[PDB]
Enzyme design. Structure first.
Site, PDB file in Angstrom:
ATOM      1  N   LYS A   5       2.750   7.578  -0.197  1.00  0.00           N
ATOM      2  CA  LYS A   5       3.024   6.173  -0.091  1.00  0.00           C
ATOM      3  C   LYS A   5       3.243   5.667  -1.527  1.00  0.00           C
ATOM      4  O   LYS A   5       2.303   5.686  -2.365  1.00  0.00           O
ATOM      5  CB  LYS A   5       1.805   5.489   0.516  1.00  0.00           C
ATOM      6  CG  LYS A   5       2.071   4.127   1.013  1.00  0.00           C
ATOM      7  CD  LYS A   5       0.988   3.147   0.590  1.00  0.00           C
ATOM      8  CE  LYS A   5      -0.359   3.467   1.154  1.00  0.00           C
ATOM      9  NZ  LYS A   5      -1.185   2.218   1.304  1.00  0.00           N
ATOM     10  N   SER A   9      -0.971   8.164  -3.249  1.00  0.00           N
ATOM     11  CA  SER A   9      -0.640   6.760  -3.249  1.00  0.00           C
ATOM     12  C   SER A   9      -0.438   6.154  -4.639  1.00  0.00           C
ATOM     13  O   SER A   9      -1.082   6.497  -5.618  1.00  0.00           O
ATOM     14  CB  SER A   9      -1.763   6.010  -2.542  1.00  0.00           C
ATOM     15  OG  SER A   9      -1.631   4.616  -2.665  1.00  0.00           O
ATOM     16  N   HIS A  10       0.482   5.215  -4.676  1.00  0.00           N
ATOM     17  CA  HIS A  10       0.703   4.345  -5.791  1.00  0.00           C
ATOM     18  C   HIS A  10      -0.401   3.292  -5.805  1.00  0.00           C
ATOM     19  O   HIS A  10      -1.261   3.262  -4.912  1.00  0.00           O
ATOM     20  CB  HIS A  10       2.081   3.658  -5.645  1.00  0.00           C
ATOM     21  CG  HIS A  10       2.241   2.831  -4.392  1.00  0.00           C
ATOM     22  ND1 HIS A  10       3.329   2.002  -4.189  1.00  0.00           N
ATOM     23  CD2 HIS A  10       1.465   2.705  -3.286  1.00  0.00           C
ATOM     24  CE1 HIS A  10       3.223   1.415  -3.008  1.00  0.00           C
ATOM     25  NE2 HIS A  10       2.109   1.830  -2.434  1.00  0.00           N
ATOM     26  N   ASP A  20      -8.973   4.038   2.794  1.00  0.00           N
ATOM     27  CA  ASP A  20      -8.526   3.579   1.486  1.00  0.00           C
ATOM     28  C   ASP A  20      -9.708   2.839   0.810  1.00  0.00           C
ATOM     29  O   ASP A  20     -10.332   3.358  -0.116  1.00  0.00           O
ATOM     30  CB  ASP A  20      -7.293   2.682   1.613  1.00  0.00           C
ATOM     31  CG  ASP A  20      -6.966   1.948   0.313  1.00  0.00           C
ATOM     32  OD1 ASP A  20      -7.399   2.431  -0.758  1.00  0.00           O
ATOM     33  OD2 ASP A  20      -6.271   0.906   0.360  1.00  0.00           O
ATOM     34  N   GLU A  75      -4.377   2.764   8.422  1.00  0.00           N
ATOM     35  CA  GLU A  75      -5.175   2.728   7.203  1.00  0.00           C
ATOM     36  C   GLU A  75      -6.080   1.486   7.210  1.00  0.00           C
ATOM     37  O   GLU A  75      -5.661   0.423   7.659  1.00  0.00           O
ATOM     38  CB  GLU A  75      -4.247   2.742   5.959  1.00  0.00           C
ATOM     39  CG  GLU A  75      -4.947   2.322   4.658  1.00  0.00           C
ATOM     40  CD  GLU A  75      -4.063   2.373   3.413  1.00  0.00           C
ATOM     41  OE1 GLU A  75      -3.186   3.255   3.345  1.00  0.00           O
ATOM     42  OE2 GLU A  75      -4.262   1.535   2.491  1.00  0.00           O
ATOM     43  N   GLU A  91       5.463  -4.435  -4.017  1.00  0.00           N
ATOM     44  CA  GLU A  91       5.781  -3.092  -3.687  1.00  0.00           C
ATOM     45  C   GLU A  91       7.198  -2.967  -3.086  1.00  0.00           C
ATOM     46  O   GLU A  91       7.592  -1.882  -2.692  1.00  0.00           O
ATOM     47  CB  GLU A  91       4.743  -2.556  -2.724  1.00  0.00           C
ATOM     48  CG  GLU A  91       3.328  -2.423  -3.287  1.00  0.00           C
ATOM     49  CD  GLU A  91       2.352  -1.884  -2.242  1.00  0.00           C
ATOM     50  OE1 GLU A  91       2.800  -1.644  -1.104  1.00  0.00           O
ATOM     51  OE2 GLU A  91       1.161  -1.682  -2.536  1.00  0.00           O
ATOM     52  N   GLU A 136       0.038  -4.094   5.435  1.00  0.00           N
ATOM     53  CA  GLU A 136       1.275  -3.289   5.300  1.00  0.00           C
ATOM     54  C   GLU A 136       1.776  -2.712   6.632  1.00  0.00           C
ATOM     55  O   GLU A 136       1.013  -2.108   7.394  1.00  0.00           O
ATOM     56  CB  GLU A 136       1.082  -2.095   4.333  1.00  0.00           C
ATOM     57  CG  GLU A 136       0.285  -2.371   3.041  1.00  0.00           C
ATOM     58  CD  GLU A 136       0.050  -1.111   2.142  1.00  0.00           C
ATOM     59  OE1 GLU A 136       0.644  -0.050   2.416  1.00  0.00           O
ATOM     60  OE2 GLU A 136      -0.751  -1.180   1.171  1.00  0.00           O
ATOM     61  N   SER A 166      -0.671  -1.118  -6.461  1.00  0.00           N
ATOM     62  CA  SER A 166       0.223  -2.246  -6.333  1.00  0.00           C
ATOM     63  C   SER A 166       0.748  -2.641  -7.696  1.00  0.00           C
ATOM     64  O   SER A 166       1.791  -3.267  -7.790  1.00  0.00           O
ATOM     65  CB  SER A 166      -0.470  -3.434  -5.669  1.00  0.00           C
ATOM     66  OG  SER A 166      -1.062  -4.254  -6.659  1.00  0.00           O
ATOM     67  N   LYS A 184      -5.849   8.027  -4.740  1.00  0.00           N
ATOM     68  CA  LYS A 184      -5.502   7.208  -5.893  1.00  0.00           C
ATOM     69  C   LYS A 184      -6.212   7.778  -7.127  1.00  0.00           C
ATOM     70  O   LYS A 184      -7.437   7.679  -7.236  1.00  0.00           O
ATOM     71  CB  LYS A 184      -5.951   5.759  -5.670  1.00  0.00           C
ATOM     72  CG  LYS A 184      -5.014   4.943  -4.802  1.00  0.00           C
ATOM     73  CD  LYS A 184      -5.671   3.696  -4.239  1.00  0.00           C
ATOM     74  CE  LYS A 184      -4.668   2.752  -3.611  1.00  0.00           C
ATOM     75  NZ  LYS A 184      -5.327   1.739  -2.665  1.00  0.00           N
ATOM     76  N   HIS A 222      -1.296 -10.693   0.905  1.00  0.00           N
ATOM     77  CA  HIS A 222      -0.043 -10.914   0.263  1.00  0.00           C
ATOM     78  C   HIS A 222       0.887 -12.002   0.782  1.00  0.00           C
ATOM     79  O   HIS A 222       1.223 -12.926   0.025  1.00  0.00           O
ATOM     80  CB  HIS A 222       0.703  -9.598   0.270  1.00  0.00           C
TER      81      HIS A 222
HETATM   82 MG   LIG Z   1      -4.820  -0.456   1.394  1.00  0.00          MG
END
Ligand SMILES: [Mg+2]
Length: 419
Positions: A384, A360-361, A308, A281, A204, A161, A363, A333, A152
């Site tokens: 999250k 989790s959401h 993840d 993560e 995010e 993150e 992106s 997810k 990102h």
């Molecule tokens: Mg991830």
């Protein structure tokens, strides 16, 4: 008593891409769910027509809701989550949902469960708790995304993150305020050291400052926590997304500064030792089961290791992980697996094998708030869903306040092991 109508439509997500929304109508009302969007996951079906949305259109997934799934669901008993989720999976016929699309099916699955909650006269989270056999619902500690790196940010930052989490809050109402205050405090610091432009936000809602020292980010957070007034009440969560720095060929990682997995553990140790980091993560590549396994042991009792990319919300990846004792926390997810029944099955399975579950959401999100209810109904104590900034993140945080209000002052909060 039955489903009267099922309809799909293409809507816009939070970064300007189409996704799928489904309404299930019964005599009780119109129940509306939308799908989020972020090798081993359930297929997200796109049209790849380059003349619409740069190929990212969802007309075909919608057509699949309206032409195949709907006629199959009308006249059915929305109370029957498991049965209807199987019918939809058997309609597609493929192990990864690649004919109808996980985005067509999930929207149906969600909306059906909402119709079913109305049918039972309970809020969605109570209904989910029942389907999940949750013994005690609870509000989750929110792990807010505040600092970006890796793919990102144009930062020197390599890891994806950094998250702050108000683990010593006494309720969600207080957690959200705490998170918010540290956020404004963070912005303030960052703007002092880098300038106005540096505090504009990522997808995010957190910041992508041009940091340059691999060691400058964790202490920024510690500084934001103190200035906010919450010294010693926050923990820290990381998401390395290590896959993105790796060479299947060089067998190493590029923090060009190439380093071993052995060597990269040295770094994770020095951080969890120094800082109040409680979750890590994707610390290694999504196929580095052994690199994952060692750090998990190393950090037994200090920090959870969360899959993840590793586990991709996938039972056969999770069983792989459990065999190699590779992580002890699942990122959850719903749109990677594709039905609520499976997502719940996955959560029960990880929990029963001793894992935590972080809901989790993605992106790419929408104003949908399903996961706020899910995480409560599953009782995981962990979500999250963004920084406390951007409507597709805050709609979730707000839904959580609403749920906590409804539960009353008796209502439980956070993750016990972090409390
Ligand atoms: Mg991830």
């Amino acid at each position: 008593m039955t489903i009267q109508k099922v309809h799909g439509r293409e809507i816009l997500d939070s970064r300007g891409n189409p996704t799928v929304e489904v309404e299930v109508t019964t005599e009780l009302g119109v129940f509306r769910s939308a799908v989020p969007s972020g090798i081993h996951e359930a297929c997200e079906l796109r049209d790849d027509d380059k003349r619409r949305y740069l190929g990212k259109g969802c007309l075909n997934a919608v057509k699949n809701v309206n032409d195949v799934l709907a006629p199959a669901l009308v006249g059915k008993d929305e109370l029957q989550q498991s049965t209807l989720d199987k019918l939809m999976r058997d309609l597609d016929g493929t192990p990864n949902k690649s004919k109808l699309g996980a985005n067509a099916i999930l929207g149906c699955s969600m909306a059906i469960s909402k119709a079913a909650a109305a049918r039972k006269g309970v809020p969605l989270y109570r209904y989910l708790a029942e389907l999940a056999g949750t013994k005690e619902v609870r509000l989750p500690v929110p792990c807010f995304n505040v600092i970006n790196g890796g793919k990102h940010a144009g930062n020197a930052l390599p890891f994806q993150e950094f998250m702050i989490a108000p683990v010593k809050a006494g309720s969600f109402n207080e957690a959200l305020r705490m998170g918010a205050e540290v956020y404004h405090s963070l912005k303030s610091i960052i703007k002092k050291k880098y300038g106005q432009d540096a505090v504009n936000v990522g997808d995010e809602g957190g910041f992508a400052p041009p940091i340059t020292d691999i060691n400058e980010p964790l202490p920024i957070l510690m500084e934001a926590i103190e200035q906010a007034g919450h010294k010693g009440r926050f923990a820290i969560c990381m998401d390395s997304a290590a896959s993105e720095t790796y060479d299947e060929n060089k067998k190493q990682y590029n923090l060009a500064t190439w380093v071993t997995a052995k060597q990269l553990a040295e770094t994770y140790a020095k951080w969890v030792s120094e800082y109040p980091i409680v979750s890590l993560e994707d610390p290694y590549d999504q196929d580095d089961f052994d690199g994952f396994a060692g750090i998990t042991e190393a950090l037994k009792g200090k920090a959870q290791v969360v899959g993840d990319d590793l586990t991709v919300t996938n039972v056969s990846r999770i069983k792989t992980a459990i065999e190699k004792k590779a992580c002890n926390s699942l990122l959850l997810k719903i749109n990677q697996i594709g039905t609520i029944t499976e997502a719940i099955e996955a959560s029960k399975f990880c929990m029963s094998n001793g894992w935590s579950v972080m809901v989790s959401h993605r992106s790419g999100e929408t104003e949908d708030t399903y996961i706020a209810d899910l995480v409560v109904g599953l009782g995981t104590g962990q979500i999250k869903t963004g920084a406390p900034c951007r409507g597709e993140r805050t709609a979730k945080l707000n839904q959580l306040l609403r749920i906590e209000e409804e539960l009353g002052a008796h209502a439980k909060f956070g993750f016990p092991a972090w409390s």
